[PDB]
Amino acid sequence: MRYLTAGESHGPRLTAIIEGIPAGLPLTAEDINEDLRRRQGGYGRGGRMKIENDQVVFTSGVRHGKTTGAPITMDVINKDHQKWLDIMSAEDIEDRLKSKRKITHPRPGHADLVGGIKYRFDDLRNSLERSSARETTMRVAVGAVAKRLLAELDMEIANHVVVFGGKEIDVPENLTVAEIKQRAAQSEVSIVNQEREQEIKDYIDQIKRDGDTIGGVVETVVGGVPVGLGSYVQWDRKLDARLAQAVVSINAFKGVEFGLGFEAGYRKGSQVMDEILWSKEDGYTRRTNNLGGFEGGMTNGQPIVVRGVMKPIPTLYKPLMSVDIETHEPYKATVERSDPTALPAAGMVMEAVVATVLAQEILEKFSSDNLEELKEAVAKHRDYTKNY
């Protein structure tokens, strides 16, 4: 299974094509819209998010509620585009109008300047329009399709904020994936423990009044995973490593870690390995989950636990120093529309990207031209695993 996303922030619309989903999967637009809606939200996002109402339009690969195995195409319109018809026209317009919203003041922390050097642009809007996170809308759309697959295979996934601009959220011990998703869904900041709900909001508004931005750490958990997805025989077959690329490819993300993660570099061997247990009732399991679901680049059957750090949004309403690309003189950075933080939204993109890599791995490991054989292949493999 593979895919490509396309579209510009202020273009007419976004598009994604997914090639390789099995035939037979029940799939509706509501299956996608629920996640699209979750991605637009989170306390701290404003502006564009109150202008868009992201919903999907399928134009291929889905027939009468089920996929057919053909490429699936999903669209999401940009309502805002009616204000950028000339500026973002595909066709040429007269010289004289091109100057409009032309960007020559790169913003620190964004792709503007380097995208201009690489692609040799005279207008950095040509870097901005694609590098913008509006694109994550289609990543979530692809992840919602991936999630339908995981749901048919009795797997569960959830995401929650565990660090918000420095505030470490004390998560209760031994929550199920279902509990994580339900608690988190009740918060406007995706935290499982809310006595901090009002405290974090206040802070986002401080930061907001203060004219600054914050980021944090988001955690994705996956339950019911089959054992032996990924492989140690070659470096690029390791599933944790595959997930690492996908997480870090999310706009603003600067790191990814599994289970204890970086803490594992501060502890002893005996405090980190997860002992192996067996029962006639359940077959193999592990006493603890410090490795976050992976042994040797492979799923061991415990929950997958991965965290990603999102740096603060680069756009500051209180600029920062930059340089004017036409004069080479220092100046403040351009101020494009943005928010004090988009962390909860980033955690939804993270959930979608993890689900997507997972679904890719499942489709590669098991017979999967169609849902029936895949579901059969997975049941058989879970029976084998249980009785090993």
Next chain:
Amino acid sequence: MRYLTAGESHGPRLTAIIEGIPAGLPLTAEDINEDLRRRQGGYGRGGRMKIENDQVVFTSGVRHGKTTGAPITMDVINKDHQKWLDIMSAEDIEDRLKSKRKITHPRPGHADLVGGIKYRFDDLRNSLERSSARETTMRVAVGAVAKRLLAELDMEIANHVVVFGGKEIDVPENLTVAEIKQRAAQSEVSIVNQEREQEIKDYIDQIKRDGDTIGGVVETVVGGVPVGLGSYVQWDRKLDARLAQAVVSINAFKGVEFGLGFEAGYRKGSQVMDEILWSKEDGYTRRTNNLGGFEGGMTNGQPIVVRGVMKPIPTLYKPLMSVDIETHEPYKATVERSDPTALPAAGMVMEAVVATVLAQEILEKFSSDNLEELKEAVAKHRDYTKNY
């Protein structure tokens, strides 16, 4: 450029094939051997590291001291194989001899059990032989070819330990890559500040007496990096993300971060973006390097700064709890030859892997059938960059 590594820990030899290096790159067995030697070192490694004397043998693609563009084949013999001629024989032997060194007690933390389930093994040695970090020897070897290409393009790379089993190393501000390489080579634990050298060493010794293991955090730095390598136009073209997959693919790595890394989730935007500066003498630069060389998934010209966390080595001489796979009874894990720590060596592995990806990215971006045209494409791009 692409490659495959092969070989078992106690098989006769390790092998690697590299396809796609440009013709005309000066390359010698000593260019490789220097790094193989580093990989074998580091206070805390014993056993095998005194038996093996890792050196390469070229058998294709190198002629008269230069690559030809054809596939390069490198071999590294396993001197230890002499003690395993029967056990690791490619051809069938007497059934009665097959139980030798057979493993039925998986080790927590290692690939034993899950590899056994995935591949349907009755002898967990079949997992161990290939999941062993003995394979990282060939990754270092491929890395040494990649480093020669970086050297030809005026780039420099180094690695050092910045956290050793929880002891954080105090790194002097403003060191060049060359100083980090030089100071680290004077330490038995690869730290650039030897004030904790004896303390780290005695800590290792304690760990070993205590019968436990420790990991840490290694940092790789790359200097003189061309701008605009990597792209934001699609997620899987982001170079930070490609490095992420490669770093976490290293045995025992549970995480990866760039620049400030996870600490960016604890700061404000104004304390994280790197301001943009310009001078007639140097072109564009950045005031600070909190982003570790990456904006928008692309190199910004600042030093690339990446860290990976190595969990503690799973094999404890004081074995943890497990299960006998033939009887399903609880039992202590198998105790195989291992060391209290392999962090310094992991650092070298990371250095090679980072270099590998980077050379791959350079070979994608520039005309690179031969070194001549590659060097010219790179100089020309550097000139463009400098004058943007």
Next chain:
Amino acid sequence: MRYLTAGESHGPRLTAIIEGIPAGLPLTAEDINEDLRRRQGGYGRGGRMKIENDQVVFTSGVRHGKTTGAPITMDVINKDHQKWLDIMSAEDIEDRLKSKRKITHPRPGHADLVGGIKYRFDDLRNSLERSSARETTMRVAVGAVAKRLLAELDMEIANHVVVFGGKEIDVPENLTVAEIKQRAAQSEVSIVNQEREQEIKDYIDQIKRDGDTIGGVVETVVGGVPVGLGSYVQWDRKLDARLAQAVVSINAFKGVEFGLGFEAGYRKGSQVMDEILWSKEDGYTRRTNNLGGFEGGMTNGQPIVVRGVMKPIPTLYKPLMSVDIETHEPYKATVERSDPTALPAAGMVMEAVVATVLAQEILEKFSSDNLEELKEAVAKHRDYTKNY
């Protein structure tokens, strides 16, 4: 450069995304539409070709006349979809309405039955809608983008029919690419010598009235190609082999050959090899082009000459024998809407696919994040080639 095509024959629309085209390439909807029009033509096409008027819509990656380097999305609407609103709805509909246009009598030669076994379909139109050649419309839209790149690099391409249902064309010797393009465009069956045009039209009418079909052989020729695209150093880098996959992947194609092709298996070495020549004026050239522009899987600078055989359309109006997948009784294949032949269109698809593969090979060989750098590299390479 990579791309995906998507869409069903009777769904709402077709879509394609191309990822990786350099920034800076002039591109308009007319650059695409000219080839979409060619593809709908050819004496012998009717039905659908009378309902559709294929024209593109760009929704991403194109701004004010040029590419930006971001993913390019193209749509082609299916006007006919208004007749299939229920039959092809993405949303589920009442069970009884699903019998509408349901295929249970598979057509010999088409993807019907096999797709039904592979994907576990009960309705074989689910095989039909995606396997149908309506999809070639988007492969031609991608080729048109590829062809714009080839034109900025001073390359030319043309296609022509050389066999039309067994009638071989007597092709004058030593025509240029441009001559081929011009002469074939003045013919209603894309033949460059019209002595048999009326005979071929009369034959097509005959096949039609008899409820039969015909295919033939088309030839694509590419001029001005750079030397050394492709490589012999690994089998999958050979450019003639890469083209071979792309040509056979066109619907109804059953084979591909280069230069003399299969005739080379009937002649002696001395009658096939192309002698090497050199002059201060032209640099290296070849006396003849029996090899069709390739030596060792690499372009040698002569015209690329490649031929593909298109088998006859499978859907015959006097249907062949098949089986009712519901009762297992013998029954005549279903008769869907089809032409007696679509060879001239198939020629345009083949021109597009060849140009695509070649653009991809060029983008891989040369620095090509943007058009300016790509043009400078190709000029430089041509300079080195001429003066070798």
Next chain:
Amino acid sequence: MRYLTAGESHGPRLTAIIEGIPAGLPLTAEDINEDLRRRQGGYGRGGRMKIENDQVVFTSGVRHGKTTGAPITMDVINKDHQKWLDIMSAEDIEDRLKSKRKITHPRPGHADLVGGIKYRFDDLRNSLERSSARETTMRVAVGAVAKRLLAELDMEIANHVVVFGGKEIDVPENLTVAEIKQRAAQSEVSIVNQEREQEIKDYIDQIKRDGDTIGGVVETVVGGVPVGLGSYVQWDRKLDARLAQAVVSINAFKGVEFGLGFEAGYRKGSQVMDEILWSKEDGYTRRTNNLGGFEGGMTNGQPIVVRGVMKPIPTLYKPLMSVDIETHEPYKATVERSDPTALPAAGMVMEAVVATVLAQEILEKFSSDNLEELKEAVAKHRDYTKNY
């Protein structure tokens, strides 16, 4: 599954690494060696083939007679290397010695000149050593591993010469794969009709005394093929097209065709489609096999029938004009002893590459981390197919 081949014709040895073969496959050196012996054979092959005695050495991935799922490494020594130790040494040597056997006279029909332009060589030996068909030895080694997988899945493969230097071999009607395999290797020229055996040998001799070369056409046939391998959903998923690239990648191959092949462009649809039949005994079948086992890029369950044309060996005793690359002066190329033909050996290479691609497709289609699950999946899939 993927693999890389490496080595020079006059280097010390050839090497291949295959990654992704399921654990559990019985495999021995003789499994490979049988094919390697066939590949050295064929009337018309002389020189080298009498010195070389190709046998494989396994150095990884094979233990006690079975694969383990890790990367497999195979070596084949070049006995001829002994006469080239200086010339082909990896390490640098005195400048005065580097001109030994330097090549500056490109052979028409070979990779020489174009390779030296591409890779900017002064010595065309660096093109020649790797472009040589000596490399096909490792492609046949790889194909032998693939063939072992096919045999475990009850599939059979064979190759025979159908056209020899223009002599069309009259093949009996409807030979099975096993018949073709048996008859063909009773022949020193791989033909299934031995009334023409002496005739072809004499013709080969005649060509040789005439100082010329011949090529021809080889047909590979595959039986017991599962249905539904390959897909129509995207062009690059079609298995006929994947086989096309593999076949045209063989040195000297200039075309590939399936079933009736190019003859399908001369016939009518009624004379080409294969009618679909069903019986309670055997399930679905076809009345004829004009399509060569493919419908919509997918296997239909009839025997795969593919033919490739091999141009004649380019090196001749008859003169062919070329140019001296150091002087730009014309010269006549002539080789006193060259083989007149390598067609029967090319047929072995064709069988191997075909077998390889099929194994790859099978590994992709079905659950295949280990042989046991693969077998189970294939069995389940044939039961579904038969009972559709």
